[model samples]
Target: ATFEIVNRCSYTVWAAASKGDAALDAGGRQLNSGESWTINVEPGTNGGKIWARTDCYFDDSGSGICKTGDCGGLLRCKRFGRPPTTLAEFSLNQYGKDYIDISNIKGFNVPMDFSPTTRGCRGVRCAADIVGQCPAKLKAPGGGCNDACTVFQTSEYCCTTGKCGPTEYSRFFKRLCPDAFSYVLDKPTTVTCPGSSNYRVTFCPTA
Candidate 1:
């Protein structure tokens, strides 16, 4: 049997289990927001048990209610018997946000990191060589692209120019200011937003 875990939170979370647990290992890695993990399960005399743990403040008592000061909550676990006809789905939503969905799993394993790129407006060109540029662009001080503007396909200098083409910048406001987001602001203006992140690297499992 196999199990899959989805991280629906806006941030990363760590997954782990007890060392003696029969089906799965006791330690795992951090999973990025919106990522999923699949792992294999060993058939055993007792139904298999799996748990996901995170440092984020949230209630896992199945009550669906979380308080501000609750940094540590009870671990959530699932049991599989008869290979579960359907896959199990889980979500890690924002604090005080109660939205979850479940799905089936073809396999199971702990994930290390899974940060997906935010989708941006498409088909609009704001400047020469710039594609997928949003219209209501906000120029971080010095009139260059901010970390949130990576999908924009133009040099920051081109965007700062009054003659730069038009794309709706307002569409990206929420993404640029997502809660708990981190970005680099000290790179040269000509560089792309992702290029500005000093730690940026290609870590996709397939890449």
Candidate 2:
């Protein structure tokens, strides 16, 4: 599978991924507005994720801080990014099908479009201005909107244990982007397509 990661936001963003430690795009890349990067994934890979970090400043050593989606402050991420970042998740060539989705479970920063490029599978997107419309309690220090689990850490939103239900906060996200996995138990959000498909993952996609 291949991913075309594009940045359409007005400002620059650092694209980060954690897919087998080899680090896609050398783990991270600075994408100025209108910039894009393409990555091909090995078959049968699972648990892969791509995210964009905003307002980052890195020095010569590729070490610095990002206002949002910082992963150990490294330019190349070795793991998942912090909260308040949108995500494009993938599990490719798993039993002849590729599972893909856009997740807001960690919260929202930039809008995203995760869509297939080969077949007629449905594309998932979250383009609402969640940051601008973020609730007071779920607002992060930076410009992103925090998930209920990140802010409250309660079982209702986090689903740390038994069955859980969506709260007002999760419903807010769901209302804005129905295709995203708004909460931990939102099992219906995944989109399954044939294996070996190419995908376009666009940030701040208006079309």
Candidate 3:
């Protein structure tokens, strides 16, 4: 299977990936406007993620900070980006299907869209102006909204124990993007794609 990472944004966006050292067929590179990078994952590649990193400046060696989706100051991300980031998650060939979803539970930075470029798969889109519209209490210093867990740090928001429930912050996100996950245990946003399909994920997809 392959993932086509497309940038439709006006400015440049750095991409990040994590599953371990051997993630992101692109090795987490920057995609300029109208450009795309494709990563090939072997079949049955489970629990891989791709996200957008914005407002970045790096030295010649590609180490710098990002306003959003910064992966611990590294250009090539070996770890998952620190929230608040928009995420596209995948578990290909899971029980004869491709499990897919878009998540804003970690909070959101950009408008993202994940869809089947080939066929036999449904689209999962999260194109919302979460940063511009987040509640002041949940705002992040860098950019985007902080997840409820980040803001409150309570069991209700973090779901640290039995039965993760929803807070108003989560309720807020769920209301906006009904098709995307707002927390750890949410299922509405989780769906499956028929196996053997190519997918395209776009950042700042409103364009």
Candidate 4:
């Protein structure tokens, strides 16, 4: 009979056998990581049974097998039967805190609890159709509510302030000018202010 051994774990597995049921010797060959092996067995004779073991080193003392107790890392033998029809499914949540749907395969819920930092942005707003300029007096002493206050337009606004201001403007400007600070969203139109610098502006796209 022909038997194929597959390494399901992330590490490699070693296989060895002897005529008498004695302790495994160290001189046996070692299998590299992520590999499989095949062996042929003859009809009944002292054709000693083959034993497969893996380096469960990480389990306790680096080797999966335990010296005492009921914990020995050895492959169980199975009589000739049809290969399992079900395939094992593995999943990962790049963003630790979110939910992933694997119902297609396991038919049940497999919830993974991970740190939120692993996941992408949780509540991000789309910026496809947003347009506008930043609020002029963001850091101004008295809550940028005066006529001189500039308004930065964006699709997203912070929950606080009930209105977007300098903080909002800074965010919008950075999206347009990643490298520099000087930006004019509107047309090249010029604005004249008494005793102030002549400001040139342009209209930014809407939506």
Candidate 5:
């Protein structure tokens, strides 16, 4: 499956991906406003994560730190970078199906749209003003709303225990962006599509 990552934000965003080996545009790219990057997914890849790094300045060698989602200051990320980032997570060719979701599990750095182009599947979006409305305890330093799990690390928020429920933090996010995966166990938001479907992931997308 192909994943087209578009940067619709007014600012530049270095797009990053993980868990799909080298098929994910060597793991990252520099995308200015209105720019887009295409990634062909390797078959059978699961738990693939794609996100955008905001407020970045990279040198010629493709090395720099982003205010959010910094992968050790490297433009090409090998792993999912630091937290407080909106995530487009997907699984390709899993049980002959493709599963996708937009998650605020790490947090929200930018709004995102994850949708299937080839299939008639519904899209998922998290475009709320999380940064402006972030609770003081869960606000990130530079920008974005920090997840309760990352901020508190308590079992109640992190779900370290086998069983857990939603918290005030998760509810806040859910109330704003109902389509996104707000909490650790937010399974209802996951969407399944055909295995051959092509997906579009847009950062800072409009309604």
Candidate 6:
């Protein structure tokens, strides 16, 4: 199957995903507005993710930095990307349907539209302008919104209870994007896809 990442925003976005040295392709790459990159992952791959980094600086030696979603501050990501990012996760070839969802588990950076290219599987998108008017306490300097847990780091906001539900801050994100996950067990945010097919993930879909 394939995970296609499309950038429709006004500016460029550095796309990243999970592909190590042993993997088929280098998961680290960049995409400009209106450009798209496809990650041809093997079917049945589980626990894969996609995200974008903004305001980055790369040195001639390939070492660089990003304002948000920096993966070890390197041009080519060898590990997981940093948080305060929009996370699109997936589990393919599960019985008949594939499981996919977009979440702000770390935090929200860019708006996202994730859906299957074929089949009538449910699609999830986060179109909220969370950074434009994020609360003073939850705002990140350059961009993106910080999750309650990252800001406060308390048991209440962190959901350390394991069996806890939504907090006031979590409700803030949930209110804007009901399809995205605001907490761990956000069952409503989890949806299954029908058939094995290619998927589409667009950043800043409104643009």
Q: Mind giving the per-residue lDDT tens digits that candidate 4 earns over 46-163? A: 2232222333233333334411111234332221101100111111222232221101010100111111122232211111211123244432222111111123333223223344
Q: Which ten residues in a row have the lowest lDDT in candidate 6?
A: 19-28
Tens digit of lDDT per residue, candidate 5, span 101-183? Answer: 98888889899899898856788888888888888998888888889999988888888885889888999999989999889
Cα-lDDT of candidate 2 = 0.88
lDDT of 6: 0.81
Candidate lDDT (C-alpha), each: 0.27, 0.88, 0.83, 0.24, 0.86, 0.81
TM-score of each: 0.25, 0.95, 0.93, 0.22, 0.94, 0.91
Candidate 5 local lDDT, residue 158: 84
Q: Which of the numbered candidates is closest to the native, going by highest lDDT?
A: 2
What RMSD, rounded to one decimal, does every model reach?
19.1, 1.4, 1.5, 28.6, 1.6, 2.1
Q: Which candidate ranks first by TM-score, i.e. highest?
A: 2
How far residue 60's Cα lies from its native spot in candidate 2, in Å, is 1.1
Q: After superposing candidate 6 on the true structure, give the runs of residues whose Cα lies further than 4 Å from its correct spot.
A: 19-24
Model 6 RMSD in angstroms: 2.1
lDDT of 1 by residue, 30-122 (tens): 457667665543322122233333333334443221111111232222223111111112212223221111111111111122222322211
Sorting all predicted structures by lDDT, with the top scorer first, yields 2, 5, 3, 6, 1, 4
The 10 consecutive residues of candidate 2 with the worst lDDT sum are 18-27
> Residue 120 CA error for candidate 2 (Å)?
3.7
Q: Model 6, 38-152: lDDT tens per residue?
A: 8887777677788889988888876898888888887767666776888888878888778888887788899999988887777899988877867788888778898888888
lDDT of each residue in 1-207, candidate 2, tens digit only: 778899998989999988746566567889999998987767887888899999999999999989889888999887788889999999989999999999999999889999999984788999998998888999998879999999988888889896898889989999999889999888678988998889998999994
For each candidate, how many residue pairs have backbone atoms clashing (under 3 Å)? 20, 0, 0, 19, 0, 0
